[PDB]
Write a protein that binds this ligand. Structure first.
Ligand SMILES: C/C=C(/C)[C@H](N)C(=O)O
Ligand SMILES: C/C=C(/C)[C@H](N)C(=O)O
Ligand SMILES: [Fe+2]
Ligand SMILES: [Fe+2]
Lengths: 255, 261
């Protein structure tokens, strides 16, 4: 008979993780990616392509590893009796993943391509990466897929969270905090890509993916005893820490 | 580079898969559950309650272990480059799971309760098990929670498929072939449960879980799309054969309970 933690012990867990996202520099003010996406004057097609290829790999990994995380938790609930409040938080994970995988939310079902082309890392690849690729060399395209070390480190932790029953809770809790600021960075940055002084991204609907996301954008409800509460907090710290370092790695490349 | 098998090979796989479902005697005319559901004159509260408790546990594990099997495949896809056809088959599996977990299909959202009360095993527990449970003694309730052996072997094989990248494809392939006949059978069985002289299910809306399933399975008019080489194809067929046989024996167990002496 699994239950979530009591209400006040769960609210205490929400402050500790909000204080862990603070301590990791993931707010709009404190992370170099967000400022750089505002302050930089323009961005070369090679730089913007490389960031777009890294983002494609990272958001692909996030989608598949959060789903694997949900699966790892499904494995547990198959053998125990979760109470209805836990099942409610479980559905929430399934619904949220369904945006990136299926475009469930109305913000996405409008503009997103149908079928697999609307999976968010594919939609991104098709409408951001691909128009930029035409402006860089084959050698640059190969170089961009050799991911930098802080990007590789985040993907490595994502693969570990794919096997952890709280993995999907840890990943969604941190990524939904920062998702809005990331998509705003991208709207600035990819407006500022000029090939021959001319913007690669000129029309409005070239930003379909970025705009839908800026429009669109509790996980503690999946923590069942106080021990799991502590492994939650620990893993968020590690996870926020690596997300910050990889976002900083974006900023260093735009300058 | 990670693609499905050529359409020619996938049709051979699909034909081998229908052969295994035939050999397992899961078809409408084959399986003792469907026959018994047609034939019996009445069903006792205790017998119907027991089959419902068994079904609650079976559809719960089916939902969770298919989702877990989908998670297993996602782990692989995180580090490979699945092409669009694979990605389309992966989307489909996620959508079908959403029927039981979130009532995604409009035939279910039309009638199901919202939130976790609408998860199909919970919904069944609330609308089928509970009113039967008012008509059985506490000792009979406890006894029904002791799952017979063929039900336990099926649950255990579900647990094994929960880790297999092919698991969700295997479970949906078999279950989507028999779901209509199962739902039809439940409709007949629970239509025949009498308590005083009174039907335990005397109002149309009490059948809403079953009728919704019957409508979803009817109204609608593949999984081999997730197979990426010959070796996975052989494994697929082999696991379908195991899993189909275990469903058949578990349904035969329903049929035996409804024809007890
Ligand atoms: C905007 C940030 C995200 C992680 C999006 N959900 C995506 O699709 O990349
Ligand atoms: C009718 C058979 C099924 C597996 C249904 N999907 C259910 O929820 O039990
Ligand atoms: Fe997204
Ligand atoms: Fe169902």
């Amino acid at each position: 008979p699994l239950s979530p933690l009591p209400a006040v012990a769960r609210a205490e867990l929400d402050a500790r993780t909000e204080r862990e996202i603070d301590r990791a520099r993931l707010r709009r003010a404190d992370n170099g990616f967000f400022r750089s996406a505002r302050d930089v004057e323009s961005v070369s097609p090679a730089d913007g392509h490389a960031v777009a290829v890294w983002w494609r790999q990272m958001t692909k990994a996030f989608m598949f590893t959060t789903l694997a995380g949900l699966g790892a938790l499904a494995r547990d609930y198959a053998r125990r009796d979760a109470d209805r409040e836990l099942l409610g938080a479980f559905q929430t994970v399934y619904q949220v993943i369904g945006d990136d995988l299926d475009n469930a939310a109305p913000e996405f079902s409008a503009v997103a391509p149908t079928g697999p082309a609307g999976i968010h890392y594919v939609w991104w690849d098709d409408t951001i990466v691909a128009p930029l690729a035409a402006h860089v060399t084959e050698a640059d395209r190969r170089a961009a897929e050799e991911l930098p070390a802080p990007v590789r480190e985040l993907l490595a932790a994502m693969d570990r969270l794919a096997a952890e029953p709280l993995g999907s809770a840890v990943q969604l809790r941190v990524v939904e905090t920062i998702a809005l600021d990331i998509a705003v960075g991208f709207r600035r940055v990819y407006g500022k890509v000029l090939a021959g002084g001319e913007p690669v991204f000129g029309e409005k609907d070239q930003f379909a993916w970025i705009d839908a996301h800026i429009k669109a954008e509790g996980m503690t409800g999946l923590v069942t005893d106080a021990e799991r509460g502590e492994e939650f907090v620990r893993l968020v710290e590690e996870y926020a820490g690596l997300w910050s370092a990889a976002l900083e790695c974006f900023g260093d490349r735009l300058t």
